[PDB]
């Protein structure tokens, strides 16, 4: 609506594959499409040290 700002109401920001970003009345959580399980933190398992 405003020059197509970068924020606007697009999708999430950049979750992993199989994870969604929803905004329930409790807060914005994550919906797991593969297992269907739900979470509340940004899933990003990345250990470049091991």
The sign one gets for the Cα dihedral 50, 30, 35, 15 is negative
Pick the CATH number of 18-40 from 1.10.357.10, 2.20.70.10, 3.30.365.10, 3.30.930.10: 2.20.70.10
6: Cα within 13 Å, side-chain hemisphere: 1
Beta bridge mates, 32 = 19
Cβ(39)–Cβ(45) under 8 Å?
Answer: no
Residue 1 and residue 3: Cα distance in Å, rounded? 6
Cβ(31)–Cβ(24) under 8 Å?
Answer: no
CA-based max dimension of the chain: 45
Cβ(15)–Cβ(22) under 8 Å?
Answer: no
10: Cα within 13 Å, side-chain hemisphere: 8
Q: State the Cα angle at 34 between 30 and 38, rounded to 5°.
A: 30
Residue 13 and residue 33: Cα distance in Å, rounded? 17
What approach was used to elucidate this structure?
A: NMR
Retrieve residue 15's tokens: 């979750």
């Amino acid at each position: 609506d405003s020059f197509w700002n970068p924020n606007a109401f697009e999708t999430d920001s950049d979750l992993p594959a199989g994870w969604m970003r929803v905004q329930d009345t409790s807060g914005t959580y994550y919906w797991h499409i593969p297992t269907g399980t739900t979470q509340w933190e940004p899933p990003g398992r990345a250990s470049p040290s091991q």
